Design a binder for this molecule. Sequence first.
Ligand code: HEM
Ligand code: HEM
Ligand SMILES: Fc1ccc(-c2c[nH]cn2)cc1
Ligand SMILES: Fc1ccc(-c2c[nH]cn2)cc1
Lengths: 367, 367
Amino acid sequence: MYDWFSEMRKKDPVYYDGNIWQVFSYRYTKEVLNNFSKFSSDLTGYHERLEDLRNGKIRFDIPTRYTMLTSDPPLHDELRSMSADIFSPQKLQTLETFIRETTRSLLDSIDPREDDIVKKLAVPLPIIVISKILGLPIEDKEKFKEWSDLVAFRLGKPGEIFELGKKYLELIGYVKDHLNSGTEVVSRVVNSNLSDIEKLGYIILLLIAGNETTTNLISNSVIDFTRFNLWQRIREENLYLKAIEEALRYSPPVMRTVRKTKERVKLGDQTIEEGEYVRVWIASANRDEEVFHDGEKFIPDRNPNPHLSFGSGIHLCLGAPLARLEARIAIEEFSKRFRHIEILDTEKVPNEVLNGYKRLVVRLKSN
Amino acid sequence: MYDWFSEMRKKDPVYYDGNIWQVFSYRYTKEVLNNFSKFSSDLTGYHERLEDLRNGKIRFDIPTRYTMLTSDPPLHDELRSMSADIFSPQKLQTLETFIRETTRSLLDSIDPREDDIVKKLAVPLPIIVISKILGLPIEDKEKFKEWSDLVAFRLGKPGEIFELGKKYLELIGYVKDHLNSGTEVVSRVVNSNLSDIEKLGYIILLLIAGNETTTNLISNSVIDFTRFNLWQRIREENLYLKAIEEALRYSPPVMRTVRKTKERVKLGDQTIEEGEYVRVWIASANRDEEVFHDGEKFIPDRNPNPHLSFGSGIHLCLGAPLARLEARIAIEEFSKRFRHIEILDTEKVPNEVLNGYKRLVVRLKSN
Ligand code: HEM
Ligand code: HEM
Ligand SMILES: Fc1ccc(-c2c[nH]cn2)cc1
Ligand SMILES: Fc1ccc(-c2c[nH]cn2)cc1
């Protein structure tokens, strides 16, 4: 999205729209994210219903209502502790070869005359890698993409009421069916004596929730490097690491997130009542000129680059080192295999939270 | 969409993608559009089936397969000549007050603190105006919106999709129910020598086909004038006419259209065989530096501005004077009524042909 928020960011960085509060500046976006005690993520009934989950009174419910993402400490910390080591530097270092190979195998199926980079590269790569990490097999590639979209859409509407549909029911059945093929962190979850619903929620968060966002990081990067004609400079000056960070800043896969106030609290010059929703715009914060000099310019070797695209504070994205690594390898291999990219057509994901491409059609030259 | 085509437009303006031909430059796009005898619009078998339509041997089919849009001379001219005067300068001048009064009532619905101008202004205005012109009542507002979307979607996929569907069926039922209650051009069509299927197609085309495109012009205009900070200047210098022309050039509601070759033809250095599909990118043509100097700049008083957004040649949009008038009055009244627009959120229509906004959320100050 174009940076609409400059003036808001300047003159109304904390704004009540008649329904909720919206936050546009970096200072107050970061402040909200880090102050978990005043700005709660308990938006989906998890703390409220924890007793009835554990004692079994709730049998049929939405698993993604009960994950670490919509919990506060101590609950949040108890849950996240269980998978804190899942993407450790040592684990990712050994995985690099598999990610590079998967990437190359995906590039092998691209038709240079015309092909959809979303379909051929950006969608399959995260799905294949996370399946490998968790030891949960991809039986039906189609269903995995459907699950990835569905879950991402749902996470984007916390507290909103959606009955389980046919597809989500199939996802649940898959997870139930494949528990014991999982690697260590899946085992920890199954052996934990968390409620069944929580176990489902937790596994689905790890297996599925990171796919659509990482897919969009990859597409957004291809878009940005092409738009600003940066491929040769990225190759020549080895800017892959910093260029992915600039893509994250400039085109965040997650545009915004939301909190609910636990008490009356002051934010900037505004007083926000207890129980109010506070929507925080990562996309706008990332262009804040008081933090990012020439913030409307795409600078592939920008540094420092303290963007908020993975959040900030206790919910800082658990997947961040994996998503960074996947996107860097995807771009490296893409930049190595092809030259002279020309974009033929694009189509945006129709979503206000999820920022990415449904279609990215390109023409390429080999070598 | 960002001008991706810049590359193609200069190095590969006529490109075979393995499946169809795609044209990106102004010169060849306009050449294709104007050469109907070589580049046919007959993509739905209208000419092949004309005899069996007119003698009653075809009684079931998709009505929108049989309109002037997908026909060549002489059929095209027979059809268009029946409604050539429907939007005459004299008829539109008598409609100005109704359009203005309608617009003001719509502007009344906008909550300055936050509102979606797509929902409040851009979507309803064309529907209300064309219903008035044709004397066909808007009995269900939501249904007319659904029909405007599905018909627009179908027209963007000429010759594909051979199934009807429940919403389309309700549209057909609606038209059949009102065949004899409309104004003169509706009566002209209904009492003509055309087949029943054609009459249905013709009425659908006039009543419904113009809504989504005109809506997008209004939205794209609001976007562009805001993005480039042009509202004050458009007011002061009275630039409404040329500014709307520049919105059309820069942000065409119809991105592209399609033709089929009737014979082997040369286009540029390329040789196109008979029976080939030729996709013509209005959006790229409109940025051609050889025709529009500083073509990537939005210049609200650009003149000349020979954009192709309403097409070129015998299919040159019949509704152009109406769409232009509605957009002008919408923008005029909006600019008089409000100040200090700030955009809070946008969402694009997920379509490769239709260029517009599903949501355009803004905050405003009154008078
Ligand atoms: C470019 C890709 C990604 C982006 C932009 C992204 C973004 C984010 C953001 C902004 C948050 C914090 C949300 C909040 O504060 O309310 C978050 C949390 C989280 N992310 Fe991601 N993410 C990405 C990829 C991934 C992947 C690949 C995984 C796992 C395989 C993952 C797993 C998680 C988890 C488990 C949390 C919850 C952390 C907690 O609540 O303590 N993410 N992510
Ligand atoms: C900004 C709004 C509009 C745009 C950008 C637009 C664009 C176009 C284009 C590009 C064509 C030619 C397609 C081709 O050559 O294959 C066309 C044709 C046509 N338009 Fe529009 N249009 C708009 C509004 C309207 C409205 C409001 C109406 C009627 C109420 C309308 C009715 C028609 C008809 C009947 C044709 C077919 C003309 C023929 O085949 O001779 N249009 N339009
Ligand atoms: F709406 C949302 C918000 C956040 C995610 C997310 C963050 N890390 C992995 N997935 C997905 C959808
Ligand atoms: F895909 C398309 C193409 C053209 C139209 C159109 C042109 N004038 C009125 N409606 C609609 C949808």
